[PDB]
Amino acid sequence: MGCGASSENSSVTYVNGRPTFVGEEVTKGFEKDNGLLFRIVNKKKKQWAYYNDTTQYEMHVLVTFNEDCDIKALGKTKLEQQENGEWVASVVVYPCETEMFIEGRVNGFKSKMDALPLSEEYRQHQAEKDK
């Protein structure tokens, strides 16, 4: 319609590493830097996926969906409904790694992301990767 600003200079380019998951539609959450976090969505399985690029900041995903939404929880993503009638799904993704989020149909939802510093939990996660 106009937008009034330039977007998607050219597909998507990674630096720290490429995502181990590929869907169809790709977009960047934060409008700063290479992109930090790229939202991966596969129309086929309709499963969402997040890939962390930054190796100094952990990506935290917090998306809320409306009651009327056929969505599911993937990986260890915690999914629960509130009394008001809304679905919540949160999951943290560590750098050089990719985790699954939610799957299904999305209807009226709010997305909130941030860039927190690799907490002590990140250090422990390294042990899980190998020992």
- Sorted by sequence, the CB contacts under 8 Å of residue 90 that are 6+ apart come out as 60, 61, 62, 63, 77, 78
Calpha distance 19→40 (Å, rounded): 9
Calpha distance 121→101 (Å, rounded): 19
Order of strands, sheet of 109-117, starting from the edge strand that comes earlier in the sequence: 78-81, 86-93, 57-66, 109-117
Residue with tokens 């009394």: 83
DSSP state of 33: T
Calpha distance 55→128 (Å, rounded): 17
| Solved using | NMR
Task: Determine, yes or no, domain membership for 53.
Answer: yes
- CB of 53 closer than 8 Å to CB of 38: yes
Alpha-helical segments (H) within 48-119: none
Other CB atoms within a 10 A radius of the CB of residue 32 amount to: 9
For residue 24 the two structure tokens come to 């169809």
Query: What are the distances in angstroms from CA 130 to CA 75, 116, 124?
Result: 19, 24, 11
Total domain count, the chain: 1
Q: What is the largest CA-CA distance in the chain?
A: 53
Task: Determine, yes or no, domain membership for 46.
Answer: yes
- Sorted by sequence, the CB contacts under 8 Å of residue 96 that are 6+ apart come out as 16, 17, 52, 55
Task: Determine, yes or no, domain membership for 2.
Answer: no
Look up residue 100 and give its amino acid: M
Task: Determine, yes or no, domain membership for 3.
Answer: no
Query: What are the distances in angstroms from CA 6 to CA 24, 38, 39, 101?
Result: 21, 18, 19, 29
Q: Which domain holds residue 92?
A: 25-131
Task: Determine, yes or no, domain membership for 38.
Answer: yes
3-state helix, strand, coil in the chain (%, to 5): 10, 45, 50
